[PDB]
Design an enzyme around this catalytic site. Sequence first.
Site, PDB file in Angstrom:
ATOM      1  N   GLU A 128       0.876  -1.207   0.000  1.00 18.59           N
ATOM      2  CA  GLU A 128       0.000   0.000   0.000  1.00 18.59           C
ATOM      3  C   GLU A 128       0.905   1.247   0.000  1.00 18.59           C
ATOM      4  O   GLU A 128       0.600   2.213  -0.688  1.00 18.59           O
ATOM      5  CB  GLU A 128      -0.893   0.053   1.219  1.00 18.59           C
ATOM      6  CG  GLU A 128      -2.015  -0.964   1.210  1.00 18.59           C
ATOM      7  CD  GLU A 128      -3.101  -0.629   0.211  1.00 18.59           C
ATOM      8  OE1 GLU A 128      -3.035   0.430  -0.478  1.00 18.59           O
ATOM      9  OE2 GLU A 128      -3.973  -1.483  -0.099  1.00 18.59           O
ATOM     10  N   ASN A 153      -7.688   9.421  -5.495  1.00 20.78           N
ATOM     11  CA  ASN A 153      -8.584   8.482  -6.237  1.00 20.78           C
ATOM     12  C   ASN A 153      -9.426   9.255  -7.204  1.00 20.78           C
ATOM     13  O   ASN A 153      -9.613  10.423  -7.066  1.00 20.78           O
ATOM     14  CB  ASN A 153      -9.470   7.682  -5.297  1.00 20.78           C
ATOM     15  CG  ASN A 153      -8.674   6.950  -4.211  1.00 20.78           C
ATOM     16  OD1 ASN A 153      -8.851   7.177  -3.011  1.00 20.78           O
ATOM     17  ND2 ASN A 153      -7.754   6.197  -4.632  1.00 20.78           N
ATOM     18  N   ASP A 192     -12.565   9.241  -7.659  1.00 19.14           N
ATOM     19  CA  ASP A 192     -13.750   9.784  -7.052  1.00 19.14           C
ATOM     20  C   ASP A 192     -13.517  11.104  -6.291  1.00 19.14           C
ATOM     21  O   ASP A 192     -14.452  11.692  -5.731  1.00 19.14           O
ATOM     22  CB  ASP A 192     -14.487   8.724  -6.228  1.00 19.14           C
ATOM     23  CG  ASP A 192     -13.773   8.332  -4.953  1.00 19.14           C
ATOM     24  OD1 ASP A 192     -12.726   8.872  -4.655  1.00 19.14           O
ATOM     25  OD2 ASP A 192     -14.247   7.432  -4.265  1.00 19.14           O
ATOM     26  N   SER A 222     -11.617  11.305  -3.462  1.00 21.95           N
ATOM     27  CA  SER A 222     -11.119  10.936  -2.175  1.00 21.95           C
ATOM     28  C   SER A 222      -9.599  10.718  -2.327  1.00 21.95           C
ATOM     29  O   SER A 222      -9.005  10.661  -3.371  1.00 21.95           O
ATOM     30  CB  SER A 222     -11.793   9.684  -1.649  1.00 21.95           C
ATOM     31  OG  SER A 222     -11.423   8.578  -2.436  1.00 21.95           O
ATOM     32  N   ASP A 239      -6.231   8.546  -0.263  1.00 27.90           N
ATOM     33  CA  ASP A 239      -5.720   7.500   0.651  1.00 27.90           C
ATOM     34  C   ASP A 239      -4.505   8.015   1.413  1.00 27.90           C
ATOM     35  O   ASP A 239      -3.633   8.671   0.794  1.00 27.90           O
ATOM     36  CB  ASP A 239      -5.364   6.276  -0.138  1.00 27.90           C
ATOM     37  CG  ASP A 239      -6.547   5.631  -0.781  1.00 27.90           C
ATOM     38  OD1 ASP A 239      -7.661   5.790  -0.389  1.00 27.90           O
ATOM     39  OD2 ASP A 239      -6.328   4.781  -1.608  1.00 27.90           O
ATOM     40  N   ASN A 294      -8.782   5.595   3.414  1.00 29.48           N
ATOM     41  CA  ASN A 294      -9.503   6.468   2.511  1.00 29.48           C
ATOM     42  C   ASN A 294     -10.416   7.484   3.137  1.00 29.48           C
ATOM     43  O   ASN A 294     -11.106   7.222   4.152  1.00 29.48           O
ATOM     44  CB  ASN A 294     -10.286   5.587   1.558  1.00 29.48           C
ATOM     45  CG  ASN A 294     -10.946   6.347   0.486  1.00 29.48           C
ATOM     46  OD1 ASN A 294     -12.119   6.690   0.588  1.00 29.48           O
ATOM     47  ND2 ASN A 294     -10.227   6.624  -0.547  1.00 29.48           N
ATOM     48  N   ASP A 343     -15.325  -4.326   9.788  1.00 28.64           N
ATOM     49  CA  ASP A 343     -16.494  -3.741   9.109  1.00 28.64           C
ATOM     50  C   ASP A 343     -17.252  -4.797   8.302  1.00 28.64           C
ATOM     51  O   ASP A 343     -18.300  -4.489   7.725  1.00 28.64           O
ATOM     52  CB  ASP A 343     -16.035  -2.629   8.140  1.00 28.64           C
ATOM     53  CG  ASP A 343     -17.123  -1.591   7.845  1.00 28.64           C
ATOM     54  OD1 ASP A 343     -17.858  -1.206   8.786  1.00 28.64           O
ATOM     55  OD2 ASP A 343     -17.202  -1.138   6.668  1.00 28.64           O
TER      56      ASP A 343
END
EC number: 3.2.1.17
Length: 129
Positions: free
Chosen positions: A35, A46, A48, A50, A52, A59, A101
């Site tokens: 990562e 990203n 969208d 957003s 990281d 995120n 989650d």
Amino acid sequence: KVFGRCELAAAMKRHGLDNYRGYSLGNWVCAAKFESNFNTQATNRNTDGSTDYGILQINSRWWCNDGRTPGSRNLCNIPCSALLSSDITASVNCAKKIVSDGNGMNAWVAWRNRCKGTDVQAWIRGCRL
Ligand code: NA
């Protein structure tokens, strides 16, 4: 901070990630390698809008607040900048919420594609833990 492999393993162990929700320490070390290349300051934007953040690329759409991701939640209740610290505590604490989650470590696309099903114990071999 750019961690060494064993130094990070040790830090992660100390913060209770070894076998957290059944994921052995090598899984977390492998995830961090792919990562962020073990760099706490890593950021990536990203499509969208957003971003990281940090060693585990957490995120901003769901997990932290960066002030520029509209309609996002902040489920870890922390500014995303906290995730870039040389002290990995905030990242580890938010990671424990993410892995709980429902999708386990599949939340980390690099884990799914590069660590899942591989011999992840290799990532902690040689280390004094
Ligand atoms: Na957010």
